């Protein structure tokens, strides 16, 4: 029965707790939680001890952030794996450079300006994709350039810059290290992610 | 049945839930959260729509948050009343000396050393209650003086400190404004709290 606004707040709890759980792959007794429920809050005598039942929950949080750590690698691995294998695609076609670090870059337009340095601030607009071709950001939303300093982006970004003459325009692709690296809290960017993006460099400016 | 381990994970995971629920005065029917949860992890089509229970939620946090609220600034209140009231009794005491901030003040020993400054550092040992003399502080524990800066401290210790020749041990009485005031995430100290303090200055130094 959801007569009562009692059974519809309890009723919608219970599918929360149920989506959340099934996304997770958790096996659950749905009767047995509500036998659990009703006697701690009747205040009856549970059928297990406080120590019983804090010993099966300290084994569940464990394995459970066993199995997140073991798919965590498990993608890290596989984009890893991805990643070298456009990169070393990648380098025998036409117009790419390979520099020492392992960054690729391949000239579209060629600017007669100044190259920046470290400490310099620059302005760019520029589209950042994956190598699937999802895009995870571009100032072509903003409307607007977008304003830096070379020593606080991306070490991917630090390396090519310091190369730009300004007024280029340049399409570059990034070892996952000299990106975000084995880390993902979220976003479309995982762990162990190479990344291409077009970027162009329209003007550099001294701090002092 | 609590058989298996999935009916004990499971009845742990109620029982947990029962008692939150049950100390935060949720009024919850476990066969109808039952229902919702067993609905949603075998895929079935929920009595209620995604709206719906996303509109019974939001509604249930709101009316929650409203609550914590107005009991914790009736306990703000309270804690302020009985602090004017202590306050209000111990200026008639002996030796008790009053400031224009409302810090109170009481000399058990006098010292013959250096006042503190501002910007310097002292050694001291004290130890800290409530109006009801639960003690939530000491030095007594470490056993061994603690080092701070005067104006790193709570408001009434800058107050006193600055008043204390080395060597003494006063008693003072601080208003909750002169200590953490509307605040209470936890410890033994709630909102709007007047605290006691003994306090022994063993030694004072300079910055430069
Ligand atoms: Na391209
Ligand atoms: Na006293």
Redesign the interface.
């Known amino acids: ?2 007569a009562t ?15 959340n ?2 996304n997770q792959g958790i ?15 009747s205040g009856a005598q ?3 001890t406080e120590q ?2 804090k010993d ?2 300290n084994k ?1 949080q464990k394995d459970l952030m066993a199995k997140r750590t073991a798919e965590f690698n498990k993608k890290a691995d596989e984009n890893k794996v991805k990643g070298e294998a456009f990169l070393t695609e990648n380098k025998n076609k036409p117009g790419v450079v390979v520099l020492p670090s392992g960054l690729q870059y391949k000239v579209i337009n060629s600017g007669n300006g100044v190259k920046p340095g470290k400490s310099d601030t620059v302005t760019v607009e520029y589209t950042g994709r994956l190598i699937d071709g999802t895009v995870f950001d571009s100032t072509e939303k903003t409307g607007k350039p977008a304003t830096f300093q070379v020593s606080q982006v991306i070490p991917g970004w630090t390396e090519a810059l310091q190369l730009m003459p300004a007024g280029s325009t340049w399409e570059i692709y990034v070892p996952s290290g000299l990106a975000y690296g084995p880390r993902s809290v979220g976003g479309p960017i995982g762990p162990n992610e190479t990344l291409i993006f077009k970027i162009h460099l329209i003007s550099v400016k001294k701090s002092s």
């Open positions: 029965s959801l606004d009692k059974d519809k707040l309890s009723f919608s709890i219970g599918a929360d707790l149920g989506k759980f099934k096996d659950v007794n749905p009767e047995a939680m509500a036998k659990g429920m009703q006697d701690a809050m549970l059928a297990l019983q039942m099966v929950l569940f």
